[PDB]
């Protein structure tokens, strides 16, 4: 399954 995040990675 392709995942298409709409935001950058957040560590916080």
């Amino acid at each position, epitope marked *: 399954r392709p995942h298409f995040p*709409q935001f950058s990675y*957040s560590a*916080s």
Partner: single-chain antibody
Amino acid sequence: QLMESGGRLVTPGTPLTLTCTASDISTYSISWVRQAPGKGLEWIGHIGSSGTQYYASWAKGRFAISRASTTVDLRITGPTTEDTATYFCARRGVGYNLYYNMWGPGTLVTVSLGAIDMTQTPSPVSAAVGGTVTINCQASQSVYNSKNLAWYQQKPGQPPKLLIYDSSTLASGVSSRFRGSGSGTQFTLTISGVQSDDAATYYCQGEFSCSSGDCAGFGGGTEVVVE
């Protein structure tokens, strides 16, 4: 803690900047959200950790989000009485999904000369101490990736508190008396073992396909009143 600052009384057309500080925000992405007196939360827009900008369509040309070093700012470009509201900043939690794990308590702006619908259970809903209440949240279009939906508890004058994210994941430190369920367009919050202190307004909040409309929306809020 996040803290919003800079709210005051201004005349229509007078640019006003609000600030968002922590006590390291430079690693945080931040959204601005407002709430007119007695009304629901409304997303304004979002700035990434490196300055990428996202806006609600209604906010274009009315609000400009910027950041540098220690601070994230919101300029209210040309205010009207439509803009009288408490303004909140909120940090996005861990991962890739748009939900917020920390809020400030808000700053009040007053302006004076002196297609997404998220429908929740109508206010108020009554619950007895020790009982169980369920709150509905229906979205006109599906939330992103089926499950990108959060719930918040809001009491007067206090930072909204994250309860649930990703439809069913309990936020750190929150009582397991709170359960989130659902998928797609249909969601529930269940409060078990109701307590006097659960009296609050509850909001669902979706992330949505940014090419289908705004990236975020909120339900209208359901106030729980405890017998």
